[PDB]
Design an enzyme around this catalytic site. Sequence first.
Site, mmCIF file in Angstrom:
data_model
loop_
_atom_site.group_PDB
_atom_site.id
_atom_site.type_symbol
_atom_site.label_atom_id
_atom_site.label_comp_id
_atom_site.label_asym_id
_atom_site.label_seq_id
_atom_site.Cartn_x
_atom_site.Cartn_y
_atom_site.Cartn_z
ATOM 1 N N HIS A 189 -12.210 1.361 0.884
ATOM 2 C CA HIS A 189 -11.413 2.230 -0.028
ATOM 3 C C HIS A 189 -12.131 2.533 -1.346
ATOM 4 O O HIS A 189 -11.435 2.958 -2.294
ATOM 5 C CB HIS A 189 -10.043 1.587 -0.262
ATOM 6 N N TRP A 245 0.863 -1.210 0.000
ATOM 7 C CA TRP A 245 0.000 0.000 0.000
ATOM 8 C C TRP A 245 0.892 1.250 0.000
ATOM 9 O O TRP A 245 1.775 1.365 0.868
ATOM 10 C CB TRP A 245 -1.013 0.025 1.149
ATOM 11 N N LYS A 268 -6.542 2.557 -3.505
ATOM 12 C CA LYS A 268 -7.343 3.441 -2.633
ATOM 13 C C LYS A 268 -7.980 4.482 -3.541
ATOM 14 O O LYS A 268 -7.381 4.790 -4.586
ATOM 15 C CB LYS A 268 -6.423 4.067 -1.587
ATOM 16 N N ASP A 311 -8.513 -5.161 8.511
ATOM 17 C CA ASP A 311 -7.809 -3.856 8.497
ATOM 18 C C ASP A 311 -8.755 -2.817 9.085
ATOM 19 O O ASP A 311 -9.733 -2.436 8.427
ATOM 20 C CB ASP A 311 -7.312 -3.462 7.107
ATOM 21 N N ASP A 343 -11.794 3.347 8.841
ATOM 22 C CA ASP A 343 -11.111 2.172 9.439
ATOM 23 C C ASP A 343 -11.818 1.784 10.739
ATOM 24 O O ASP A 343 -11.135 1.456 11.717
ATOM 25 C CB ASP A 343 -9.623 2.483 9.635
ATOM 26 N N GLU A 394 -2.550 -3.053 -3.176
ATOM 27 C CA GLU A 394 -3.730 -2.426 -2.536
ATOM 28 C C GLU A 394 -3.912 -0.997 -3.044
ATOM 29 O O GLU A 394 -3.065 -0.132 -2.740
ATOM 30 C CB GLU A 394 -3.567 -2.422 -1.020
ATOM 31 N N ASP A 435 -12.832 6.600 4.450
ATOM 32 C CA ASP A 435 -11.917 5.495 4.837
ATOM 33 C C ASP A 435 -11.549 5.642 6.322
ATOM 34 O O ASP A 435 -10.381 5.973 6.615
ATOM 35 C CB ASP A 435 -10.679 5.480 3.948
ATOM 36 N N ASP A 477 -9.657 -3.596 -0.301
ATOM 37 C CA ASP A 477 -9.984 -3.095 1.054
ATOM 38 C C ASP A 477 -11.392 -2.499 1.003
ATOM 39 O O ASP A 477 -11.622 -1.563 0.221
ATOM 40 C CB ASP A 477 -8.940 -2.095 1.546
ATOM 41 N N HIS A 523 -9.278 -7.313 2.414
ATOM 42 C CA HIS A 523 -9.141 -6.527 3.664
ATOM 43 C C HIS A 523 -10.532 -6.070 4.108
ATOM 44 O O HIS A 523 -11.056 -5.080 3.541
ATOM 45 C CB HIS A 523 -8.233 -5.319 3.436
HETATM 46 O O1 LIG Z 1 -0.898 -0.456 5.864
HETATM 47 C C1 LIG Z 1 -2.020 -0.422 6.753
HETATM 48 C C2 LIG Z 1 -3.176 0.326 6.120
HETATM 49 O O2 LIG Z 1 -2.971 1.719 6.484
HETATM 50 C C3 LIG Z 1 -4.025 2.583 6.049
HETATM 51 O O3 LIG Z 1 -5.244 2.180 6.631
HETATM 52 C C4 LIG Z 1 -4.126 2.539 4.522
HETATM 53 O O4 LIG Z 1 -5.206 3.340 4.067
HETATM 54 C C5 LIG Z 1 -4.285 1.098 4.004
HETATM 55 O O5 LIG Z 1 -5.587 0.596 4.302
HETATM 56 C C6 LIG Z 1 -3.218 0.180 4.596
HETATM 57 O O6 LIG Z 1 -3.469 -1.185 4.233
HETATM 58 MN MN LIG Z 2 -6.104 -2.077 3.919
HETATM 59 MN MN LIG Z 3 -8.830 1.948 5.263
#
Ligand SMILES: OC[C@H]1O[C@H](O)[C@H](O)[C@H](O)[C@@H]1O
Ligand SMILES: [Mn+2]
Ligand SMILES: [Mn+2]
Lengths: 409, 409, 414, 408
Positions: free
Chosen positions: B253, B176, B219, B317, B287, B217, B285, B250, B277
């Site tokens: 994303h 990423w 985004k 993730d 998380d 990966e 995004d 992911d 992910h």
């Molecule tokens: O590397 C860990 C993660 O950090 C952040 O969330 C990025 O956006 C992405 O998802 C990555 O995979």
């Molecule tokens: Mn990710």
């Molecule tokens: Mn993310």
Amino acid sequence: MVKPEEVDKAYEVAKQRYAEIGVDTDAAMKELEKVPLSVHCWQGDDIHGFLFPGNYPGIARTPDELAGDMHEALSLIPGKHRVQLHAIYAVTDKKRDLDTLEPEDFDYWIDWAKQEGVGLDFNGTFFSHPMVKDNMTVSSPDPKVRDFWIRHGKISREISNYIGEKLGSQVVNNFWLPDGFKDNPIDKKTPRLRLLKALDEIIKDPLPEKNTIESFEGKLFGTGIESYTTGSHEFYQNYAISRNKLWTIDAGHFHPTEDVSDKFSAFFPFGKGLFMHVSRPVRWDSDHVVIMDDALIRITRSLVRDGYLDRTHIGLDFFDATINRVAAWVVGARATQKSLLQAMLAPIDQLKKDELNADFTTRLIETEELKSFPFGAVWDKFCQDHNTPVGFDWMNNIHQYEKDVQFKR
Amino acid sequence: MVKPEEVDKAYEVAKQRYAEIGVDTDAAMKELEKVPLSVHCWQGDDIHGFLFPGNYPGIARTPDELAGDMHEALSLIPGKHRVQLHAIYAVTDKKRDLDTLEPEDFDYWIDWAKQEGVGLDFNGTFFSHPMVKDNMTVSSPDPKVRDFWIRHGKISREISNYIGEKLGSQVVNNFWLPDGFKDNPIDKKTPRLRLLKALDEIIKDPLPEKNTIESFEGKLFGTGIESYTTGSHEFYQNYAISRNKLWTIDAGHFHPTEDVSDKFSAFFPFGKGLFMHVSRPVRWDSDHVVIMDDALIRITRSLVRDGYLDRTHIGLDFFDATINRVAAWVVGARATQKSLLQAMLAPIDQLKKDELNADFTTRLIETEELKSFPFGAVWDKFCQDHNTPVGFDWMNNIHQYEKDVQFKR
Amino acid sequence: MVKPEEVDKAYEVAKQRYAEIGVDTDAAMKELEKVPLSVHCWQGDDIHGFLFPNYPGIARTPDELAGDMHEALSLIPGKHRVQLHAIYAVTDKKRDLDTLEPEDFDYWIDWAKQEGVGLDFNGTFFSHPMVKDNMTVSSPDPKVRDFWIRHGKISREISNYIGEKLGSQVVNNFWLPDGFKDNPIDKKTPRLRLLKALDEIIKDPLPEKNTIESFEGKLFGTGIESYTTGSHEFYQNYAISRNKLWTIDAGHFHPTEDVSDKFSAFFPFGKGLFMHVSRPVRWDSDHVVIMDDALIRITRSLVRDGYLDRTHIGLDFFDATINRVAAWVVGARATQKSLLQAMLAPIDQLKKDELNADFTTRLIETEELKSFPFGAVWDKFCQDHNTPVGFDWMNNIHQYEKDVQFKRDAKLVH
Amino acid sequence: MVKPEEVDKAYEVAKQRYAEIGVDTDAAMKELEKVPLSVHCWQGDDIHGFLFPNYPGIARTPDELAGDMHEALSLIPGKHRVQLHAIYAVTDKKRDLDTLEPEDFDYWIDWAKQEGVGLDFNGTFFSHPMVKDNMTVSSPDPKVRDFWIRHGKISREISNYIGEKLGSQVVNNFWLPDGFKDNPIDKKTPRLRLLKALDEIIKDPLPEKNTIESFEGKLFGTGIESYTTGSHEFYQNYAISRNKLWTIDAGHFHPTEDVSDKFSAFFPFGKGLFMHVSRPVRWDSDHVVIMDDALIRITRSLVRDGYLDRTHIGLDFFDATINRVAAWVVGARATQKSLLQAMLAPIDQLKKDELNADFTTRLIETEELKSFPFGAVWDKFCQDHNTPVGFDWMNNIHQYEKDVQFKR
Ligand SMILES: OC[C@H]1O[C@H](O)[C@H](O)[C@H](O)[C@@H]1O
Ligand SMILES: [Mn+2]
Ligand SMILES: [Mn+2]
Ligand SMILES: OC[C@H]1O[C@@H](O)[C@H](O)[C@H](O)[C@@H]1O
Ligand SMILES: OC[C@H]1O[C@@H](O)[C@H](O)[C@H](O)[C@@H]1O
Ligand SMILES: OC[C@H]1O[C@@H](O)[C@H](O)[C@H](O)[C@@H]1O
Ligand SMILES: OC[C@H]1O[C@@H](O)[C@H](O)[C@H](O)[C@@H]1O
Ligand SMILES: OC[C@H]1O[C@@H](O)[C@H](O)[C@H](O)[C@@H]1O
Ligand SMILES: OC[C@H]1O[C@@H](O)[C@H](O)[C@H](O)[C@@H]1O
Ligand SMILES: OC[C@H]1O[C@H](O)[C@H](O)[C@H](O)[C@@H]1O
Ligand SMILES: [Mn+2]
Ligand SMILES: [Mn+2]
Ligand SMILES: [Mn+2]
Ligand SMILES: [Mn+2]
Ligand SMILES: [Mn+2]
Ligand SMILES: [Mn+2]
């Protein structure tokens, strides 16, 4: 009426304003006349065709009426362009179905295109037919349905090869399928494997590239087919790259907030060419007339700035019967041309150097200033140089065409 | 506290309810056992790592603390799983930078993984470093910046190969990159050509697939990098298919309303494998911890219905430091497992038949009824059979770990 | 077929699991009994009505539509309501929308009385020659406005009469297509014409015990994509200022928009809601309601914050690609089981945990509850109300298909 | 450098082109002069303020921030306004948000008078230890609630004082972060706590001639994604019922949401709007305002429906990756040229065509007007008001970088 002297005066000042920032307006106009737009025939007759016989008056009902309407629209669009046909626009007194069409059924359009001085692109017709079973055609689970649409697919290639041979200009043969499910499917895999197999069968028999090449048009969702589309954007980009064919990007067929101008630079490291269908979605695939908006500005400037025009065919795709159908073509075509021209009127080499040096301040200031530079003065000069009316004036032509032709139908 | 004999009894009743519609609950639980989730180490210490030394108490601050926290989470997640490392989780008293890491710097995690009985996946660390120049790394216009991150990329493969050799389990090495622009770019082509050339250099040196394979990966946008992402979803799907590598999807994303479960069946006619992910985006995004929602239900049922689990690696993730960080892992893991298990408890063969026969009435009725079948009784049996607490009961374990470990830090 | 004693046994086990976390399953089922769904008549006949001339068995007459609704309600546990459209008038007298009389609905009053359902009402402001450039009540043409104002006033007179006869308040829902296909110059004047016309429609006082009006906004519709005169903001403002109900249709909002957010921002200011549950698939597609994030959030937001006594729940969808009777039952059951799941939570304790900012407990427990045995409580609810459990009601649909829907097209209309 | 003769020649042709379609360019420019933009002070110092102590040259002091706003205003044609935040108090006294006094803003009153601009105000309800679990006035903790209610009441007393001293009404904008990161159980009670707290804040009557309050909703923010206590619906209802202003921030709505739709649904019921022009890029990213569909629609919807006199236009963005003074000028000029383009339409005739359902004429003319010489009228406006034309104001920025910003 706009005074030609006003146009000349505005242009001389605009030429100097652009020269001051390292832009050549004469060169920009030469670049614009090298970009043909593929004007879609089906806006003229509400996609009726001729095969199987609050809306604005004057719809075309015959080949001659539709040819006349396209002639009128092209007469008000500066430069030389192209026309997209659909298979259902076959002109013949023979009884035909979609699986029995013959290349000579398009002699009428070949003759018209030669006289009009335009190239022709083609679309197979995979909709509005009793053989559309549960919204599926080429990738139907029903073998008889598949076989019927595979025969139409192969015939679209033969027609396209024939037109390309006669015209001496490559026919882009665009494939759009409605295939999908209204509600949530169990099996997403098998329909896409059925599509893959059927498309490979359609393109198997080799045809001269100088005469025709195929493009594949994905969609996210359609009315009555909302939940799943067999022919997805990912499927067709993968298919185009792997089978060395064109990928069709229709600006109306993506997610809310999705910027299709992002896709070009992710495709061209891997793929051959694009068919860019400019279309205005209003909250769905509504096929509104193309206007100068963020989407069109981004599409045109992304092609111009990154030098992709020589590998990108630009087509119109929209259907608005609530307004003068000939005017619809001219609005969309002029919107596309003035947006290409604005992109060409930027100091692109210098802006790229500024960006490479991370001078984001200069890039923001200059791109914003260019939105109010006299791009209209250059566009008006282009219209006048190519014997088309300036600004509001082409409304006179539409009103005369309504009085003399459309309103008499 | 739930009573084991009552879980067993409720399972026998559910087994009969499911058997009556042609579903084998014992076989569904055996299928779930074969799906390892790759638990991300960085939720335990807010992505601090160990290389470069308001919120919930008890954050891990040392390898031993983080190792202990992951042991505790896995002890509350039924079955056999995996752990994802980041490069910054290197354990060494040697002075290291990202371009001088050595495989042996991960002996600590190899030794831990062996003792724990789990496989390891890997992530190169292309962020939070002075060599991130204007949000770009591998695809920076600055050759010194590019060369630094290319060294890290090659090292990530060398580390991954070594871990894979030592564990006898393939390491998925996920790439990423933050690379992109905050504001609208002039040149979208060149950054992606720089990325293509740099990735090709990273993967040039041959390593055995048995030990490691790379995943890529993409985004759509990130904070401070909103307008353009060099590594787009299209770029990486094209790259993965072209270079015979894995593609990372992911769930956080993509565009508003975008269903990432749509992508699998458009990829697998062309590509090798996926790294999925699972992540909850709330309007961006963000998380968030994975929960049982439409996205997770669609991801998990699309993988099991179309038989993609043997070519799809599932990783977690997310990053939520507002709650017990160990609890965060277990909530996400259990949400993913019960969602897979619910999809596995459908009469998939008969539903596929009904759908092929266009019995869409039956499909809607049955899929809706299945949402209130006793999938919970099968999930509880799976938890109990694998020596993990049932329902609310694992809150006791979290409270005890808080008292004994986390709140004492 | 599921066995009743098995349903009873699984219910006893579920009752104990929920009792252990402070949830009373008997009380949750009593709570669900008190939530009637207003089942929309127009799903039965593809919104054709009787005033103006793909799956088999479409209803073509009042008796056919009445029979189909009876069949659907027979498979939906508990006591419910039906929504009529003005075009579902039953009379041999020649009528237009501006000459309908309350007695033209005696057929439906008599049917509702013997079926044991209340009635809600909808004026019909579409599919008519007097829809001029997609506009009705708020048309710039005063002859068009006057016609639709006459229909508006009549919808209230009909609703008042039905409410009087049934002894149950009729919610009279107003939906107008009014707007523009393409970008408008004047956004202000259409909304002022709408305001003036609605005030004229509601001017004559009618008893609240008999009827009250609700106002339904829309973001966009097919052929009217760029501007909707009656916006969500316009009608929330209108409902609060004129002390009427606001209609929230779950299919009529922006991408990613959560209509369950609106209730708690409305009820500090307004009287009541008509909540139209509908599934949009990327547009206002009117798919059958299913148990999805949107339905779960709508139902749990109404239950958790105690809004059911001020919120009328109606169905609104149109899927003719499947068995039309099955469509009603899927949507109704999805809404009920979603309400029931929300009622099967330790809501008082979860509220205390949240006030203490224990977000860890809130996340763990809300996630654990999604795999508690709510299905066993739903099955018990179905069985207690003499409706088939799980897959079993497909037997009833298959029987109705053989006996009625697969033959109907060949049957003489009368 | 652009020659004034090039601006004058382009303008005379533009003036004729517009007159030919019934548009008066001189009158359009007079209309634009009547639209002050409220320039937000916090772009100059990355919202640091002075109460509680990336591109070069950030302002670090009141004099530096004042000088930077003067420089930006010198490159924006016409007369405008400045928005303050409470944390921009200038005093030697030890203050917290609940002990600020009106005279702590004497510095900005004096600067405003010398500069010839009006002042708008924002209470500061963020970046403070008393923000508890992302909540302030609507916190379930009475100690937190009471602290933030005191700040709210003081924001009104300060605004009233500034308004009395300047002889121009201070719009006092309220934005609260209050909400939840993850899915809430109780959506009702937080909004009832907010209603009671806001009513307490506005309880003590203050002259409307001096100040009026506006209330700014948000859909979601970073770390507060799942629920926002102060929703757009809540505040539109609150503004209408309590006879206050409603704040529409263009960055704070759903994907594809057109905030220009809201004005004509509000004004049959409500008193006035505070419109915060801000560019969201896929979230509430607070990008510099540019001439895009959102800005074009906002500006033309206010002009066409005659709402400018009831709509205060404020800038709201924060971009520290570029020259912070240039950021203000890009955003202000984008807003002005967009208003001006909307003012350069034959609106009365277009309205008649639309009433006659002539959608063909409407489409053709609205599209043609996008390439009419609106830039020639904009350049004439810049020149008439003693500001640089086109790229030329970059020279001013480069000089200001050399003489001021880069020396810091
Ligand atoms: O590397 C860990 C993660 O950090 C952040 O969330 C990025 O956006 C992405 O998802 C990555 O995979
Ligand atoms: Mn990710
Ligand atoms: Mn993310
Ligand atoms: O073929 C004409 C067009 O028809 C529409 O219905 C499809 O959505 C595609 O946009 C296609 O290109
Ligand atoms: O306003 C509409 C008219 O504008 C004039 O400027 C044009 O010359 C056309 O006659 C057009 O019909
Ligand atoms: O149940 C009746 C229906 O059966 C399906 O299998 C058919 O495809 C048709 O939809 C038919 O009307
Ligand atoms: O071809 C028409 C048929 O289409 C099916 O999908 C419908 O369900 C009906 O069976 C109909 O008769
Ligand atoms: O598989 C479909 C069938 O499932 C059974 O369990 C039901 O009782 C119905 O007979 C239904 O038609
Ligand atoms: O207070 C200045 C602005 O700060 C941002 O962080 C908020 O989201 C609001 O837009 C507010 O108006
Ligand atoms: O009249 C029934 C319904 O018809 C259409 O679906 C409208 O969009 C609206 O939802 C209305 O309530
Ligand atoms: Mn198309
Ligand atoms: Mn389209
Ligand atoms: Mn509705
Ligand atoms: Mn709808
Ligand atoms: Mn704001
Ligand atoms: Mn903002």
